[PDB]
């Protein structure tokens, strides 16, 4: 009825780690023309109104977010979501120029949950400062994950969950610079992106972040990083090069493909001339993009008219470290991402499939 039936259990029963095919669930409306709704009504079962959690008292099970088959499956589905909904007019992949219809859509992500079938169960790590790997001492079992919007993006993680307690740093190996670093925030900051309806450059857009509320969160992100790199001067820089998809904060808003410059978001002088007020990041809507799905290029139709707007909660930041400076009183971090599985890890880190018998 009201969400969530909590239960305790002792000793019993035996389980071992395994992989299995997980299905999804949603509150998708079969009347909605919106594309995630259209996809989820026929991809996912209706969510159970009586979810059940079970605290497995006095157990410690080890987790590893960096090898979790749930992530590979969400990627499988989010791809299927895009290949169904966001059909590019021209797709240059498989030594082929693929021309298919590209009608303008109603696009906004809804949550999807991931769920085990009979014979299997999800274990959930409730240790409130859990980085993502190794031992968990407050373990529980669940029927499905929490609601996860399949928000595809780079640099900034959007509309996700927050870290309950403190800011958390996540990496497969933090001493390895080549490994991406996921920052789970404990307090979110709104990023309010807009292509205004001029009635004129239709591709000129921007995002507005309360530079007050932000540069506080960043100073805390800095101080948390100080702990992992023996008190060293943590220092941000722009991305040192690459594709626009990763050199800029790239995301999809209302169907359109936004590219925004995050130079102004990682300003060290603010960590107090200016800074305090409103950070306005220059954005650019693009039609020809590189595809996160598979390797290739694609073109979509020109943007719709009227005022495009998304306001997203920034719930995490993808960074990469520089390295070679080890050596040095400083550690340099730059906006990263690109691997869309890292986004699904930013939510599925605390979950883990297991087989019963």
């Amino acid at each position: 009825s009201d969400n969530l039936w909590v239960t305790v259990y002792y000793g019993v029963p035996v389980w071992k780690d395994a992989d299995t095919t997980l299905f999804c669930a949603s509150d998708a409306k079969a009347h909605e023309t919106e594309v995630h709704n259209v996809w989820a009504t026929h991809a996912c079962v209706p969510t159970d109104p009586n979810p059940q959690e079970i605290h497995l008292e006095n157990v410690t099970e080890n987790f590893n977010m960096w090898k979790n088959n749930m992530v590979e499956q969400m990627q499988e589905d989010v791809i299927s979501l895009w290949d169904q909904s966001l059909q590019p007019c021209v797709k240059l992949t498989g030594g082929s120029v693929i021309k298919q219809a590209c009608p303008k859509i109603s696009f906004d992500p809804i949550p999807i949950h991931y769920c085990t079938p009979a014979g299997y169960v999800i274990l959930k790590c409730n240790d409130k400062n859990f980085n993502g790997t190794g031992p968990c001492k407050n373990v529980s079992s669940v029927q499905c994950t929490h609601g996860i919007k399949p928000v595809v993006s780079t640099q900034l993680l959007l509309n996700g969950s927050l870290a309950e307690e403190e800011i958390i740093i996540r990496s497969e190996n933090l001493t390895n610079n080549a490994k991406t670093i996921i920052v789970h925030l404990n307090k979110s900051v709104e990023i309010n992106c807009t292509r205004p309806s001029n009635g004129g450059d239709i591709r000129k857009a921007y995002c507005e972040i309360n530079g007050t509320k932000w540069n506080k969160v960043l100073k805390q992100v800095t101080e948390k990083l100080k702990e992992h790199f023996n008190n060293k001067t943590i220092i941000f820089q722009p991305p040192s090069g690459g594709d626009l998809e990763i050199t800029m904060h790239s995301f999809n808003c209302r169907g359109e493909f936004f590219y925004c410059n995050t130079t102004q978001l990682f300003n060290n002088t603010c960590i107090m001339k200016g800074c305090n007020g409103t950070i306005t990041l220059p954005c650019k809507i693009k039609q020809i993009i590189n595809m996160w799905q598979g390797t290739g290029q694609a073109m979509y139709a020109p943007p719709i008219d009227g005022k495009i707007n998304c306001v997203s909660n920034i719930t995490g930041i993808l960074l990469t470290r520089d390295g070679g400076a080890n050596n040095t009183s400083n550690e340099t971090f730059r906006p990263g991402g690109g691997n869309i599985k890292d986004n699904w890890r930013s939510e599925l880190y605390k979950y883990k499939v297991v087989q019963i018998e």
Partner: antibody
Amino acid sequence: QVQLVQSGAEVKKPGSSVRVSCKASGGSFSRYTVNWVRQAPGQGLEWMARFIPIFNMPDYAPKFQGRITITADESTSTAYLELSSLTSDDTAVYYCASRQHHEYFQEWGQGTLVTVSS
Amino acid sequence: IVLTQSPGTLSMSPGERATLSCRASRTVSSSNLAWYQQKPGQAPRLLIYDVSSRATGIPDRFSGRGSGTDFTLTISRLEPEDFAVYYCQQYGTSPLTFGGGTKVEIKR
């Protein structure tokens, strides 16, 4: 509404088996809802059995481990408790009680006096 | 896990706060503990749940609190139909257990 009504009082010889029923009306049922509690004459409450979701097995109190069997018919909207190899101090008033969102019991049945005696 | 209410009998005349409390052996977890009013000849009655939330139906009189191992079933102002036995049970942790009870007798 949500109310629970249990079978009639019963008398059993030692080393025998009793089965009490508990029928739910006007609410939500499932196996999980019913917990079984007892109370020997003028002694304290004593919890006995539940149904653990997900797993989804019976969990009993250590005292009754090998003697007990909990059951639920979903279409009939009835729960059953089955205690075996009864002994003179299994005499009690057996209550069925509805689990809620957290395991505290808001609805209790009217009780069932099982009087084991030869 | 074991839980106990001292004292067995609590003799206090009407309108007298003074109160009793539950006490866990090996600490019951998260604010996961309830209590019940049992009168002679009747079934138990849900009073409070989680630790302080008062069941639908209950008009105030019955406060209550605790967290670690000491949860006080909180009296303040008695009544003629409030002299009963008060039981106590923890949800959180191994097998669900009750507490032997405390009788509130009328003093004279």
